[PDB]
């Protein structure tokens, strides 16, 4: 790999802030936070709002009502 032409790239740990899941990777991104990692090492810590272990599609578990059928909506509003 050529020297001084590539962006700075270091090993890093991403955290899923919705559940705290973390894994080890590499990135060009920096942050003001660092955490320790198993096997005795320290890596910069990057905050991620959603990952594959907290995304509805990957997990499969939703968080809404899947809408309301209009026949059901009609019967609810009038109790039929």
């Amino acid at each position: 790999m050529k020297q001084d032409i590539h962006p700075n790239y270091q090993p890093v740990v991403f955290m899923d802030s919705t559940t705290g899941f973390k894994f080890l990777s590499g990135s060009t991104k920096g942050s003001s936070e660092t955490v320790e990692w198993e096997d005795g090492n320290t890596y910069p810590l990057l905050r991620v709002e959603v990952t594959s272990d907290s995304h509805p599609f990957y997990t499969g578990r939703q968080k809404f009502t899947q809408a309301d059928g209009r026949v059901d909506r009609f019967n609810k509003k009038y109790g039929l």
Binding site: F14, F23, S25, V48, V50, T51, S52, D53, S54
Partner: peptide, 10 residues
């Protein structure tokens, strides 16, 4: 790994 676990969910 990042594509599967970080990029696609966004």
């Amino acid at each position: 790994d990042k594509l599967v676990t970080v990029s696609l969910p966004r």
